[PDB]
RNA sequence: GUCGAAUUUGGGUAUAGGGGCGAAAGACUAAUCGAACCAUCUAGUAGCUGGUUCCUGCCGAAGUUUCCCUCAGGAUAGCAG
RNA sequence: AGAACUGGCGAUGCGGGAUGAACCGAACGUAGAGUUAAGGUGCCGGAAUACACGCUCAUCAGACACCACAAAAGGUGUUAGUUCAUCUAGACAGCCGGACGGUGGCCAUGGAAGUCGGAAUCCGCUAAGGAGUGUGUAACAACUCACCGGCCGAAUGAACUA
RNA sequence: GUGAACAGCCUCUAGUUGAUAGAAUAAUGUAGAUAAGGGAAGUCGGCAAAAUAGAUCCGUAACUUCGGGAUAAGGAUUGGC
RNA sequence: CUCUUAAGGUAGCCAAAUGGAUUAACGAGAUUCCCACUGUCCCUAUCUACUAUCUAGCGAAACCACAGCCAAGGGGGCUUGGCAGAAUCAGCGGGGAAAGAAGACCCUGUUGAGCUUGACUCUAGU
RNA sequence: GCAGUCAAGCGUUCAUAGCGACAUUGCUUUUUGAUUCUUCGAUGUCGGCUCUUCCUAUCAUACCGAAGCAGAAUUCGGUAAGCGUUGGAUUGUUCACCCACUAAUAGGGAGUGAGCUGGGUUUAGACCGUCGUGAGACAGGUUAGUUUUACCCUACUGAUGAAUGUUACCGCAAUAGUAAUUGAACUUAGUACGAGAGGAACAGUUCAUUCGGAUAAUUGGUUUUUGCGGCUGUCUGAUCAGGCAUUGCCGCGAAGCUACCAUCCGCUGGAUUAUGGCUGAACGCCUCUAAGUCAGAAUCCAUGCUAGAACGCGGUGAUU
């Protein structure tokens, strides 16, 4: 009945630049932390036997 | 407030002293605090004092000091 | 509106703000009552609670027998001293404020009430009417 | 306390209205129409 | 950090004071210094007379009294101040654990290193140095 | 009077200190006993007159007679009344001010103007 | 209080209790705070949060500490009954653990309200408040079993019959299936099962009835067996305690009929083994199902066993049966007569 | 608050600037006093706030390196012509 | 956080991201014609309410910085895939019957017979049948399920990925 | 004249009619007051109002340096012929 | 190098009236409490004199980049929307580099001095 | 929080190279409600008088499910902010708690640091205690101490105004707001519920609390009607009759104003949140849901009321 306020969808330029800096920091951290069987023939293929030969 | 001031003066005093009214020293005792001084701070002496002797007969103060000695 | 009163009470002018003194009206031995709260009082900001004739109210015994002192007890007003419009169509007011202590159930404590009792109070508390030797 | 807009009290009043609550207004409107016709005849007579 | 700038007097200009913001083992014989000479401060609420030392052997953990702060890294003047700060070694009364060195001289004290930061919680956990 | 502690010096080798009076709370504190000990200011008590009877429990009758020097009282109500009459204290037309005289009675009991003391325990 | 403590605060399992407490703390207290707020503001916020959680836990524990009967110093009858039912020692240990958890939560809230004042950063106050809430949860986590036991005994203790030992009473006793439950159903309005199987009543039953312008409460008991006062269940011990603690003419029903297949000599042996309990009770034996046996035809050898019941002066072998209720009125009249004759003599003394 | 007194006050005279006076507040000293006013040195001292006036075309960088206990103050390679 | 180098600004206009210290494009004399970038082509706003193939009903989706903290999963809300099993000597579901006998197995006893309490849990016959998955009696009884058999029939079931 | 009084008010000789005004009496303001019942429950706080006020007579306590408290306090009266 | 503790029953030995500082009076000094008292309040209402209102005449002051409708985004003006009809009169104190004021409070001066000392250089006087 | 254990998963041998969700073990002051008469340095101000507005993380009111709910009473959970959420004591301080009423005295934002206020940003006076040879501040405390709107603009509450050929009357309504809330006495009833202890609910009636709009019919208050009568000083020669004493005072005092300090009133239809069902596949069963659909909250929209676009509109009379 009484509609409640919805969160704004605006880009929030400040938040955009902050998310970009946080993404660059997370990428640097994931790069720093990085230092530490074939599927086979799929089923239901009509010509599975032909590939074996 | 006065309790925090009491704990501060007790921790800051090398030798606490406990005055007692001559009219009724047994009723002037601050019991439960002397046990805290005995336990948490054994080094503290907590010597008794008996002021206002003039308001009571001298034999009464003499018996009081003899009992608290 | 309060439990132990027979029937609903019609509105009448208030005249007993909390803390008002009132003379004792019964043989319980209290010399005067000092109101401290009014049961059923309408809560409001900045509004001091006040009572009226026939209302129950807690009150300490400001004077009287020492045994009754140092305790608050329920009390029913028997006189208001403030003008109020009776439905019959004539204003009236008691010579002085008065009341009587009573149990929360409303049963009377003293054997009898001294002095005239307001009709509105006797109609609301049957025990007060039984203990009242003079109605109006 | 029940709200003045509460559906239950409104339905109870609507059920109560069917009887004397409507019959009284009906008889009142009938008497009013009769008095109006009488006032009209009193003017038309003169 | 580690030194709050306490201010005093009707005019808070010099303020002549500092106060530790972290737990400290003041010692059994503290006997608070008189306030006029009191520059550093170690408030009693932050003080602790015990630590939750845990013995790696047997998996047991026991609350035992602290005894002394032996070696605090990062300017061991903090060790003179008794600060623990997640890594300081501390002597502890290990007699409750039943340790007994060879030769029949029963042990009643052993080193222990605090792990949990005192500032973030009131408990003073430590791993026993076997 | 001792709102806060203050440092003091004597001989340069020792520093006196004082703190506001402590009253370890207990269920046995027997409020009226808290009043007889002087811990409470008598001026603020709602009913000074009701504490009067207990002052007779401690002080000997001969001292209260010699001091005031009103005497002949019983139950302490006649005490307060005769004291308010002889002292000139009274409410207008004309009842004695029993409460104000009771305030002075409690103040004298707290200041030691009326001698009193608990009996020391008997010697072994 | 006494007399059916139905006012117990409906204790809840420790998991649901901690959940309700954390929810009430998150909902009632203010939540939003920002790093830019003054450090004193964040400190007062976390202090109010910890104090609210501690006060809520203290209230939740105090309501249980106050609403429980406090079995000790209530009455020997109710004390022995609750001991036979809820294992009195465990019933005390549970509430003692409740009080211990309450004192621990109090000490934790106090130590954390004291430590919190010195926090120099929002993260430190946040970690301190989280540590206090987790200590309170761990204290609640150890209370699960005692809280469930308290919830069970509350569900059982809240439906116990009302009774005042000082008030007039008349106990009933006998072998199972004798019809004592039918006698209670006939003598008073209280409903009780009358099924043929032996122990139709696993617990005490009560039933008020007026007589001589005076109230009376018949009290059926859940059977008794001839065992050497050690091989017995709480039900039989709870019945024996109801007799030992309750004066005023306990009734010892008996049935000579082949139904209730215990030999009448066994009934006399049980009456003799229970004889000492009745030293002041003014025993009134009441044969049951007389219509199907009519002991006037009883063999003289079996009748001699009734003479052994007569060795105690106070016994009276009343006759009664459910099929002829009119005799039950005479039995109730004799019981109330002996009761008044004892009580009036007790009052004049 | 005081109003018979260490009381209030008119005129004259003496105390005049690192001085005078002060029942003492750094209080008064001509609407200015923890040091009054007038004219000269004097357009003092500028670490610094402010401003720095008409037009067009070409070229056109800087925040980086040494040297004083050291911020400060600056000297020095470098950048452009 | 502490060092090196490559770049924009500072000294910088112009087009777009509704605008913006950094984003994308981009070599600033005055104009005409023409061709383009980023960014768009329903209106404000110049340009297709174009084409062809797939998913979305959200009780405030979405056009969001979203290859970043909440982000680990939960939804019987949808679509496409991987793996493991049954099957006209009958796949899932659907309706009916059996679900047996030492036996009411050994320990607690006013009573636990599968189902208030503890350690085992076999043989006998079957197509199968468990000292018993649950409902309910004081116990029993009875109902019901794991699995089989009776009837139509053909694709069906489970775990993960997108 | 009234009045204890050169306390307050009116009048006698004498001196003035000078302060910008006309029309209504909105809100809100400055100054002076009243108010049914409670009488400080408002406020940090009896902040401000109010209450006794002159005179005749009774009477006046603790303390005290014996001088004071003191007009202590609490009480009866005040008109006119 | 030994070595430290007895006091008795309501007022005492007593020192050549008193053993007082817990001191009387006095105070535009500050503080606690009681009687009367009353609109501080319950709960505000009314009256009077003058402003405030229109009018006859005279006639400023502060301030003034320009003038003033708002929501969101912009690391009162710019962007997207809601809107928006001359001129105006009386209350108004929510906002306006609106007056009024903003200071108190934080920091550096190489700059002025009121003061102090076995800080340095001098010095009346002795 | 610290130390440890299994592993649903991850990962070149492979979890035992390493990690690891959900769980779990040992400690933080006593298993007989015993104690807990602990309260321990916030260096920084927070707290209060009038008052508007917004949120749910809902104390109460309204509608529901569960809980050993037989009743009453009570706990949790779902929706729900439409209306309520009180009068005070304590400063030898108040980052607080108590009593009493009420259905309840729930938590938060703009706060209102030029609306006013105490603690306080408290400079110039002084004293006590600390430091320092001294000047002075300081581990402190007390005392007394001038920051003074708007007539400018805008916002809000009221009030005029040329322009619909002129004027006057009666009208419609887009728009913005909106209001009523809570408690309790009869009957049901001493009935269901209970062996008792007590003790329901719905419909039908009747009063009360807070708030809002109105009026002086009656009571109180208010007096410049200076209306009437009286009183003091003084003056007009005395009486009568009159002036001043800043409305001189007193007793009453109409008209007006005004007080829950007096009185009246403040409503009746739909769509919905949680919930309970219908039919009905998805999935040959089932299913309140996928379609449709019924009942239901103080909710939303309406009824009604308030003002009426001064550039929204209609009818009517006169129109020199
Ligand atoms: Mg039976």
UniProtKB/Swiss-Prot annotation, chain B:
Note: Present with 67700 molecules/cell in log phase SD medium.
Role description: GTPase that associates with pre-60S ribosomal subunits in the nucleolus and is required for their nuclear export and maturation.
Cellular localisation: Nucleus, Nucleolus
UniProt feature coiled coil, ranges: none
Boundaries of the shown chain within the full protein: 210 to 278 of 486
Domain of life per record: Eukaryota
Family stated for the protein in its record: Belongs to the TRAFAC class YlqF/YawG GTPase family. NOG2 subfamily.
Taxonomic classification: Eukaryota, Fungi, Dikarya, Ascomycota, Saccharomycotina
Protein name in UniProt: Nucleolar GTP-binding protein 2
Species, as recorded: Saccharomyces cerevisiae (strain ATCC 204508 / S288c) (Baker's yeast)
From Swiss-Prot, chain C:
PTM-bearing positions, type N6,N6-dimethyllysine: 105, 109
Post-translational modification: Methylated by RKM1 at 2 different sites, but it is unclear which are the 2 methylated residues among Lys-39, Lys-105 and/or Lys-109.
SMART domains: Ribosomal_L14 (SM01374)
Tagged with keyword Lipid biosynthesis: no
Domain of life: Eukaryota
Coiled-coil residues: none
Predominant cellular place of this UniProt entry's protein: cytoplasm
InterPro entries noted in UniProt: Ribosomal_uL14, Ribosomal_uL14_CS, Ribosomal_uL14_sf
GO terms under cellular component: cytosol; cytosolic large ribosomal subunit
Residues bearing the modification N-acetylserine: 1
GO biological process, one term: cytoplasmic translation
CDD domains: Ribosomal_uL14 (cd00337)
Cellular compartment(s): Cytoplasm
GO molecular-function terms, A-Z: large ribosomal subunit rRNA binding; structural constituent of ribosome
Family note: Belongs to the universal ribosomal protein uL14 family.
Free-text function comment from the UniProt entry: Component of the ribosome, a large ribonucleoprotein complex responsible for the synthesis of proteins in the cell. The small ribosomal subunit (SSU) binds messenger RNAs (mRNAs) and translates the encoded message by selecting cognate aminoacyl-transfer RNA (tRNA) molecules. The large subunit (LSU) contains the ribosomal catalytic site termed the peptidyl transferase center (PTC), which catalyzes the formation of peptide bonds, thereby polymerizing the amino acids delivered by tRNAs into a polypeptide chain.
Further information: There are 2 genes for uL14 in yeast.
UniProt-recorded name of the protein: Large ribosomal subunit protein uL14A
Organism annotation: Saccharomyces cerevisiae (strain ATCC 204508 / S288c)
Gene name for this UniProt entry: RPL23A
Swiss-Prot record, chain E:
Domain of life: Eukaryota
Coiled-coil region list: none
Localization: Nucleus, Nucleolus
Miscellaneous comment as given in the Swiss-Prot or TrEMBL entry: Present with 8660 molecules/cell in log phase SD medium.
Subunit details: Component of the pre-66S ribosomal particle. Interacts with NOP7 and RRP1. Interacts with RSA4 (via WD repeats).
Family: Belongs to the eukaryotic ribosomal protein eS8 family. Ribosome biogenesis protein NSA2 subfamily.
Function: Involved in the biogenesis of the 60S ribosomal subunit. May play a part in the quality control of pre-60S particles. Under normal, rapid growth conditions, high levels of NSA2 would allow the progression of pre-60S particles through the ITS2 processing.
Protein name: Ribosome biogenesis protein NSA2
From Swiss-Prot, chain G:
Residues of the whole record sequence present: 1 to 349 of 647
Assembly information from the UniProt record: Associated with nucleolar and cytoplasmic pre-60S particles. Directly interacts with RLP24.
Any one GO molecular function term: RNA binding
Annotated positions binding GTP: 174-181, 220-224, 288-291
UniProt-annotated location(s): Nucleus, Nucleolus
Organism field: Saccharomyces cerevisiae (strain ATCC 204508 / S288c) (Baker's yeast)
Further information: Present with 28000 molecules/cell in log phase SD medium.
Name of the protein in question: Nucleolar GTP-binding protein 1
Cellular component terms (Gene Ontology): cytoplasm; nucleolus; preribosome, large subunit precursor
Record-level GO BP terms: assembly of large subunit precursor of preribosome; ribosomal large subunit biogenesis; ribosomal subunit export from nucleus; rRNA processing
Task performed by this protein: Involved in the biogenesis of the 60S ribosomal subunit.
Domain of life: Eukaryota
Keywords: GTP-binding, Nucleotide-binding, Nucleus, Phosphoprotein, Ribosome biogenesis
Domain OBG-type G: 168-340
Membership in a protein family: Belongs to the TRAFAC class OBG-HflX-like GTPase superfamily. OBG GTPase family. NOG subfamily.
């Amino acid at each position: 009945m009484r509609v409640r306020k919805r969160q704004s969808r605006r880009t929030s330029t400040k938040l955009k630049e902050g998310i970009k800096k946080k993404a660059s920091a997370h990428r640097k951290k994931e790069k720093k932390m990085a230092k530490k069987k074939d599927p086979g023939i799929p089923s239901n293929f009509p010509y599975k036997a032909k590939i074996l030969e | 407030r006065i309790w925090n001031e009491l704990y501060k003066v007790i921790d800051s005093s090398d030798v606490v002293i406990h005055v007692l009214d001559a009219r009724d020293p047994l009723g002037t005792r601050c019991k439960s605090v002397e046990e805290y001084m005995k336990k948490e701070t054994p080094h503290k002496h907590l010597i008794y004092v008996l002021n206002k002797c003039d308001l009571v007969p001298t034999w009464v103060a003499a018996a009081w000091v003899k009992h608290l000695s | 509106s309060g439990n132990g009163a027979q029937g609903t009470k019609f509105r009448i002018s208030l005249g007993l703000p909390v803390g008002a003194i009132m003379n004792c009206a019964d043989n319980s031995g209290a010399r005067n009552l000092y109101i401290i709260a009014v049961k059923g009082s309408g809560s409001r900001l900045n509004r001091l609670p006040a009572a009226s004739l026939g209302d129950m109210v807690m009150a300490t015994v400001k004077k009287g027998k020492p045994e009754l002192r140092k305790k608050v007890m329920p009390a029913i007003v028997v006189r208001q001293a403030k003008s109020w419009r009776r439905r019959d169509g004539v204003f009236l007011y008691f010579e002085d404020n008065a009341g009587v202590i009573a149990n929360p159930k409303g049963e009377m404590k003293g054997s009898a009430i001294t002095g005239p009792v307001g009709k509105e109070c006797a109609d609301l508390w049957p025990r007060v009417a039984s203990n009242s030797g003079v109605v109006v | 306390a029940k709200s003045l807009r509460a559906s239950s009290h409104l339905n109870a009043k609507s059920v109560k209205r069917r009887g004397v609550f409507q019959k009284a207004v009906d008889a009142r409107e009938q008497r009013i129409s009769d008095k109006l016709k009488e006032d009209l005849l009193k003017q038309k007579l003169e | 950090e580690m030194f709050k700038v306490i201010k005093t007097g009707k005019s808070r200009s010099k303020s002549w004071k500092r106060m530790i913001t972290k737990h400290t083992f003041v010692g059994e014989g503290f006997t608070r210094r008189p306030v006029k000479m009191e520059r550093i401060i170690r408030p009693s609420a932050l003080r602790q007379k015990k630590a939750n030392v845990t013995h790696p052997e047997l998996g047991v953990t026991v609350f035992l009294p602290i005894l002394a702060v032996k070696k605090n890294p990062q300017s061991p003047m903090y060790t003179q101040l008794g600060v623990l700060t997640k890594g300081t070694i501390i002597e502890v009364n290990v007699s409750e654990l039943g340790m007994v060195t060879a030769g029949g001289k029963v042990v009643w004290g052993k080193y222990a290193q605090v792990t949990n930061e005192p500032d973030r919680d009131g408990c003073v956990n430590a791993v026993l140095l076997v | 009077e001792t709102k806060v502690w203050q440092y003091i010096t004597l001989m340069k080798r020792i520093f006196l200190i004082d703190c506001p009076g402590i009253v370890p709370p207990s269920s046995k504190d027997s409020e009226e006993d808290i009043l007889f000990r002087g811990v409470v200011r008598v001026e603020h008590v709602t009913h000074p007159e009701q504490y009067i009877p207990g002052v007779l429990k401690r002080c000997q009758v001969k001292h209260l007679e010699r001091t005031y020097e009103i005497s002949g009282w019983k139950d302490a109500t006649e005490f307060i009344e005769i004291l308010a009459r002889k002292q000139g204290r009274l409410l207008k037309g004309g009842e004695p001010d029993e409460s104000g005289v009771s305030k002075q009675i409690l103040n004298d009991f707290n200041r030691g103007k009326i001698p009193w003391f608990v009996l020391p325990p008997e010697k072994e | 209080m006494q007399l059916s403590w139905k006012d117990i605060p409906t204790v809840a399992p420790a998991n649901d209790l901690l959940d309700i407490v954390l929810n009430r703390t998150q909902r009632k207290t203010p939540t939003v705070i920002r790093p830019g707020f003054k450090i004193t503001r964040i400190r007062a916020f976390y202090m109010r949060k910890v104090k609210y959680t501690g006060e809520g836990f203290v209230e939740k524990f105090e309501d249980i500490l106050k609403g429980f009967p406090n079995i000790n110093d209530v009455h020997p009858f109710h004390r022995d009954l609750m001991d036979t039912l809820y294992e009195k020692n465990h019933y005390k240990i549970s509430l003692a653990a409740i009080s211990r958890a309450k004192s621990l939560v109090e000490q934790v809230a106090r130590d954390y309200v004291r430590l919190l004042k010195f926090g120099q950063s929002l993260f430190q106050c946040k970690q301190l408040k989280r540590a206090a809430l987790g200590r309170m949860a761990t204290i609640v986590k150890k209370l699960r079993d005692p809280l469930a036991y308290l919830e069970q005994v509350r569900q059982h203790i809240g439906r116990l019959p009302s009774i005042d030992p000082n008030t007039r009473t008349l106990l009933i006793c006998g072998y199972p299936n004798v019809g004592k439950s039918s006698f209670l159903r006939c003598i008073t309005k209280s409903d009780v099962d009358v099924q043929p199987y032996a122990f139709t009543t696993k617990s005490l039953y009560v039933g008020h009835f007026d007589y001589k312008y005076l109230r009376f409460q018949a009290i059926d008991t859940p059977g008794i067996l001839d065992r050497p006062t050690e091989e017995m269940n709480n039900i039989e011990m709870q019945s024996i305690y109801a007799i030992a603690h309750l004066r005023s003419c306990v009734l010892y029903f008996m049935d000579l009929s082949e139904q209730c297949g215990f030999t009448i000599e066994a009934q006399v042996k049980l009456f003799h083994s229970i004889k000492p309990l009745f030293a002041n009770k003014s025993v009134m034996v009441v044969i049951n199902k007389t219509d199907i046996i009519r002991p006037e035809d009883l063999d003289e050898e079996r009748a001699q066993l009734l003479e052994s019941v007569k060795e105690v002066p106070g016994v009276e072998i009343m006759t009664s049966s459910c099929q002829l209720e009119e005799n039950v009125m005479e039995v109730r009249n004799k019981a109330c007569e002996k009761l008044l004759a004892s009580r009036i003599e007790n009052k004049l003394k």
